Amino acid sequence: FYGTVSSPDSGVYEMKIGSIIFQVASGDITKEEADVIVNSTSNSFNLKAGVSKAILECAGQNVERECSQQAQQRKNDYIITGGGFLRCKNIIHVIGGNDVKSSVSSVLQECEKKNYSSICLPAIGTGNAKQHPDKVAEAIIDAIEDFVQKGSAQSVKKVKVVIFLPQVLDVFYANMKKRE
Ligand SMILES: [Cl-]
Ligand SMILES: [Cl-]
């Protein structure tokens, strides 16, 4: 399923996985525009540290309130909120400590359910949850490969990982070159 790894802009890398453009870059995820932005939170959906702090501060208090209230109503594997003041239609809040392949599979299925074309996510689980970056990179790309292999890619055209630490971007780049 894998295409050639190229660089469309300085420090940005991309490759095809089936019909999907998979892109990685380092920077501030809150500057991104996408149908869905993913937040890597805790099992309380109340984490406000590192990337989750940037996301909740920029998304605003209506997104914070909706997370806390949804988390009270039942036990959630993940929560879908509106985008608040982020440049997106929905935020999907995934638990950083959870299986990252499972989390990305859920995000892809929820995006197809809404006929969404673009997803932006962080290096899920590499912050608060302290999952190893190479395991997280393997898990994210494996989830997209499985999705594509099942013929599930319809509306989803672009998956972009915007990574806080350039040193973690380097791990994603190496994982992409392994598959090329
Ligand atoms: Cl995390
Ligand atoms: Cl990150």
From Swiss-Prot:
Similarity-based family: Belongs to the ARTD/PARP family.
Post-translational modifications: Auto-ADP-ribosylated.
Domain Macro: 9-180
Residues shown, of full length: 1208 to 1387 of 1801
Subunit structure, interactors included: Interacts with STAT6. Interacts with PARP10. Interacts with PARP9 in IFNG-stimulated macrophages; the interaction prevents PARP14-mediated STAT1 and STAT6 ADP-riboslylation.
Subcellular location field: Nucleus; Cytoplasm
Ligand binding (a glycoprotein 3): D28, I29, S40, V51, G125, T126, G127, N128, A129, F164
Native organism taxonomy: Eukaryota, Metazoa, Chordata, Craniata, Vertebrata
Functional note: ADP-ribosyltransferase that mediates mono-ADP-ribosylation of glutamate residues on target proteins. In contrast to PARP1 and PARP2, it is not able to mediate poly-ADP-ribosylation. Has been shown to catalyze the mono-ADP-ribosylation of STAT1 at 'Glu-657' and 'Glu-705', thus decreasing STAT1 phosphorylation which negatively regulates pro-inflammatory cytokine production in macrophages in response to IFNG stimulation.
Tissue occurrence: Expressed in macrophages.
Top-level taxonomic group: Eukaryota
UniProt-recorded name of the protein: Protein mono-ADP-ribosyltransferase PARP14
Species of provenance: Homo sapiens
Induction of the gene: Up-regulated by IFNG in macrophages. Down-regulated by IL4 in macrophages.
